[PDB]
């Protein structure tokens, strides 16, 4: 494997204290797509000052990012103390088609120390460390973000001038405050400016050595290093992944001032990254000399499309996120950053779905009512009911008895009630609680030996229960009974062969034994015919006294269909919202497998009745006959057309929702047609919607002016004047 060098000697670490409330700051920084912020340059091609369009993974224009800030650790006097970091180690994130970051943006400005912000130190760029991989889980103390097998390490060492990449198996360390230790708090790494980053000797292994205190590197398969130089100018960086492996991008290497990103490097690892995290870090400088660090942001890539404004020097200077709003879509439709003034149609609102409505047959029910009357059979004489294709509620069935034994083999007792199966079979018999030690499929007792057995090819259950005083149709045997012997004497009248009961079957001896055993120790014999090989059937039985309430036992077996599982615990909206109708909005629906989405209303009937589905000449469903006997009609759903007014001379806009009217219009839209409505809000946050003869509008203003030609007429007598000239 890779020669990373020796591990840290101590297993011990400096304690990591989580100080995350000190790091709370609100400082969002949305992407300025018109400055080409966060845009990765296209691969392998360059262009003149012509505008082109493109598709690829890019940050969303409205993404303000995730912000991270590093700080110095605890220090007092002139020396180091326990590390102080934010709780960033616990921020496990799902990897999501890469990311780009903004770094050093606040360099050459001032802020506060954050961890001890009263100091008010100036802020400068600091490089972040990260951990990536295919799996995550708990640390031995239950802490989040442990990674498994091999993971990526993005760690700067010493000063930002040296950067290293690794693919390694991390090994936890058992010392105090470290990942295998039981004193562990949180993972962190650190740097010490008093001995690290010396001006004549930058410490190339500094941050790696602090990393080594928490994890021993193990079996590393890759390592890389890079040469970097310091720069207060804002930089962009990012990561993507393909089947060719991970790719690294930055603006620093090529486009220092424009911010276009280029693929600085690539990595051999193509193992998919499913998770992403950022490593906490701390500065271990003298307390008075602690330095505040510049804000850092992360943005997530998405499969968006853009206008791109190349310069003649080939740098993209501007871009348009086509899907950000309707105006941006118009720019993309005209392939330009300066659309001619006019009124233009834009895509309609989708409206919105409402909770679903479903109608299907319901009333099957599993016939289990024979259990509630007459005298139940003796345990060797158990009665069986087979069920297929029907609906049941075993927990309701079992609430008719008090259960003194609920167990099963190869299925949990709770799961057999809830699982769907191809069949459900129940065996029932009287059974005293005094014999309960002998009722198991594995029991050594005479009940399992001769009276009842269950197959091990199917999941099975055994239940003991007793009858409540309000189930008066149930009656009881004079004595509880069972067979304690069943064998056949061999025809030579000396040899004898026992007959253990077959799984899921009556013992052969049940044919000679009376329906109940009249007295304990009664026995019977039957001569066997020469067709049986001769011999004698032999059997005997035993009894238990009758009790105040009947005691009972049950056997249950099931068969799971591969695709035939027709027996299920369907309930007719028990513990549910009762969605068989809505009167209504735009609910998704299913009607005996017919499906669509739409609004229902209680209308009048049309024939032919009981044909259920009424259709038009284009086969659109018109309406439906419900099983509550009422016709309802269906109008599916409708959408709201939108258009906008664009004044290119002032570079301003306004909108029209047409026929919808302002009764369905609100300051924001829940439906929705575009990722934001904020472009309207730039002036319309202060105004109500206005109704016009064509339709509801925003930002139009009732000036009641009379003008011959607005150059943006809305039709009718309506008109839309531009703001007056500068």
Q: Which of residues 562-621 bind a copy of itself (CB under 8 A)?
A: 562-571
Distance in Å, CB of 637 to a copy of itself, minimum: 31
Stretch that binds a copy of itself, among 7-15, 22-30, 222-230, 476-484 (CB under 8 A): 476-484
Beta bridge mates, 357: 589
**Coil, helix or strand at residue 701:** coil
| Interface with a copy of itself, residue 415, by CB under 8 A | yes
Binding residue for a copy of itself (CB under 8 A) from 423, 448, 454, 540? 423
In the region spanning residues 21 to 50, those forming contacts with a copy of itself, defined by CB under 8 A, are 43-45
- Residues 6+ positions from 466 with CB-CB distance below 8 Å: 401, 402, 404, 433, 549, 550, 551, 552
DSSP conformation letters of 501-514 = PPTTS--GGGGTS-
Count of CB atoms situated within 10 Å of the CB of 451: 30
Cα–Cα dist 161/366, whole Å: 75
Site for a copy of itself in 270-309 (CB under 8 A): 270-272
Of 333 and 395, which has the nearer Cβ to a copy of itself? 395
Among 34, 108, 354, 391, binds a copy of itself (CB under 8 A): 391
Neighbouring residues of 391: CB distance < 8 A, sequence distance ≥ 6: 362, 363, 364, 365, 366, 568, 569, 570, 571
Task: For a copy of itself, give the closer residue by CB, 286 or 385.
Answer: 385
Q: Which is nearer to a copy of itself, 493 or 519 (CB)?
A: 493
Write out the two tokens for 664.
């369905």
Identify the residue among 110, 225, 418, 630 touching a copy of itself (CB under 8 A). Answer: 418
User: Interacting stretch for a copy of itself, rule CB under 8 A, among 135-143, 213-221, 225-233, 518-526?
Assistant: 135-143
Closer to a copy of itself by CB, 179 or 541: give it. Answer: 541
- Residue 458, classed as helix, strand or coil, is coil
Choice from 5, 137, 370, 498 touching a copy of itself (CB under 8 A)? 137
| Contacts (CB under 8 A) with a copy of itself, residues 627-666 | none
Q: Do 410 and 460 form a contact (C-beta atoms < 8 A)? A: yes
Contact pick of 132, 379, 634, 665 for a copy of itself (by CB under 8 A):
379
Figure out which of the listed residues 302, 559, 581, 671 binds a copy of itself, where binding follows CB under 8 A.
Answer: 559
For a copy of itself, the binding residues in 87-116 under the rule CB under 8 A are none
Q: What residues numbered 501-540 form the site for a copy of itself, per CB under 8 A?
A: 504-507, 509-511, 513, 515-517, 529, 531
Residue with Cβ nearer a copy of itself (145 or 193): 145
Token pair listed for 444:
């050594």
Q: Could you tell me the end-to-end alpha-carbon distance of the chain, in angstroms, rounded to an integer?
A: 71
Rounded to a whole number of angstroms, the minimum distance from the CB of residue 481 to a copy of itself is 5
E-strand stretches of 136-244: 136-137, 146-147, 151-156, 162-172, 189-191, 215-227, 235-242
Exactly one of 36, 217, 538, 552 binds a copy of itself (CB under 8 A); that residue is 552
Would you count residue 384 as binding a copy of itself (CB under 8 A)? Answer: yes
Cβ density class 407-423: b for 16+ within 10 Å, e for less: ebbebebeebbebebbb
Per CB under 8 A, contacts with a copy of itself among 191-250 are 243-245
Assigned token pair, 54 = 């493109």
Instruction: Work out whether 499 is an interface residue with a copy of itself (CB under 8 A).
Output: no
Binding-site residue total for a copy of itself (CB under 8 A)? 84
Length of the chain: 726
């Amino acid at each position: 494997y890779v020669d990373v060098g020796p591990d840290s000697v101590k297993s011990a670490c400096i304690e990591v204290d989580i100080q995350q409330t000190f790091f709370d700051k609100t400082w969002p920084r949305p992407i300025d797509v018109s400055k080409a912020d966060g845009i990765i340059y296209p691969q392998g091609r360059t262009y003149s000052n012509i505008t082109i369009t493109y598709q690829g993974l890019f940050p969303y224009q409205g993404d303000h990012g995730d912000m991270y800030v590093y700080s110095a650790g605890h220090a007092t006097g002139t020396t180091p103390q326990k590390l102080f970091v934010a709780n960033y180690s616990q921020d496990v994130k799902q990897f999501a088609n890469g990311f780009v970051v903004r770094i050093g943006a606040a360099a050459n400005s001032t802020g506060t120390v954050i961890i001890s912000p009263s100091t008010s130190a100036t802020i400068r760029k600091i490089y972040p460390a990260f951990m990536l991989g295919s799996s995550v889980g708990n640390f031995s103390d239950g802490k989040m973000g442990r990674f498994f097998n091999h993971t990526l390490v993005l760690l700067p060492d010493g000063c930002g001038t040296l950067l290293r990449a690794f693919y390694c198996i991390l090994e936890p360390r058992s010392g105090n405050h470290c990942p295998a230790g039981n004193s562990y708090t949180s993972f962190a790494t650190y740097h010490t400016p008093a001995t690290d980053c010396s001006d004549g000797n930058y410490n190339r292994n500094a941050s790696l050595n602090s990393f080594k205190e928490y994890f021993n590197l193990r079996n590393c398969t890759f390592m890389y290093t890079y040469n970097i130089t310091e720069d207060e100018i804002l930089e962009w960086f990012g990561i993507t992944q393909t089947a060719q492996g991970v790719h690294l991008f930055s603006s620093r290497y090529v486009d220092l001032y424009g911010g276009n990103m280029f693929q600085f490097a690539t990595l051999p690892v193509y193992d998919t990254i499913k998770y992403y995290s950022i490593i906490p870090h701390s500065i271990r400088s003298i307390q008075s000399d602690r330095k505040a660090w510049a804000a850092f942001y992360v943005y997530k890539l998405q499969p968006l499309t853009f206008l791109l404004d190349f310069s003649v020097d080939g740098y993209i200077r501007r871009a348009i996120d086509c899907g950000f709003n309707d105006l941006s879509q118009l720019h993309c439709s005209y392939e330009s950053f300066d659309v001619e003034s006019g009124v233009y149609s834009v895509s309609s609102f989708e409206a919105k779905p409402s909770g679903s409505v479903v109608e299907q047959a319901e009333g099957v029910e599993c016939d289990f009512s024979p259990l509630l009357s007459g005298t139940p059979p003796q345990v060797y004489n158990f009665k069986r009911l087979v069920f297929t294709n029907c609906n049941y509620n075993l927990t309701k069935l079992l609430s008719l008895f008090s259960v003194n034994d609920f167990t099963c083999s190869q299925i949990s007792p709770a799961a057999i009630a809830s699982n769907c199966y191809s069949s459900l079979i129940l065996d029932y018999f009287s059974y005293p609680l005094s014999m309960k030690s002998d009722l198991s499929v594995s029991s050594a007792g005479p009940i399992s030996q001769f009276n009842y057995k269950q197959s091990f090819s199917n999941p099975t259950c055994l239940i003991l229960a007793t009858v409540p005083h309000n189930l008066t149709t149930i009656t009881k045997p004079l004595k509880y009974s069972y067979i304690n012997k069943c064998s056949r004497f061999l025809s030579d009248d000396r040899t004898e062969v026992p007959q253990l009961v077959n799984a899921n079957q009556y013992s052969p001896c049940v044919s000679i034994v009376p329906s109940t055993v009249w007295e304990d120790g009664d026995y019977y014999r039957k001569q066997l015919s020469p067709l049986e090989g001769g011999g004698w059937l032999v059997a005997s039985g035993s009894t238990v006294a009758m009790t105040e309430q009947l005691q009972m036992g049950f056997g249950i077996t099931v068969q799971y269909g591969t695709d035939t599982n027709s027996v299920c615990p369907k309930l007719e909206f028990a513990n549910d919202t009762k969605i068989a109708s809505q009167l209504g909005n735009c609910v998704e629906y299913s009607l005996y497998g017919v499906s669509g989405r739409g609004v229902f209303q209680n209308c009048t009937a049309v024939g032919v009745r009981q044909q259920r589905f009424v259709y038009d000449a284009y086969q659109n469903l018109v309406g439906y006959y419900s099983d509550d006997g009422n016709y309802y009609c269906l109008r599916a759903c409708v959408s709201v057309p939108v258009s906008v007014i664009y004044d290119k001379e002032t570079k301003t806009h306004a909108t029209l929702f047409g026929s919808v009217a302002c009764e369905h219009i609100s300051s924001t839209m829940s439906q929705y047609s575009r990722s934001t409505r904020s472009m309207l809000k730039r002036r319309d946050s202060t105004y109500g919607p206005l109704q016009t003869p064509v339709g509801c509008v925003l930002g139009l203003v009732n000036s009641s002016l009379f003008v011959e030609d607005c150059k943006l007429p809305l039709g009718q007598s309506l008109c839309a004047l531009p703001d007056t000239p500068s």
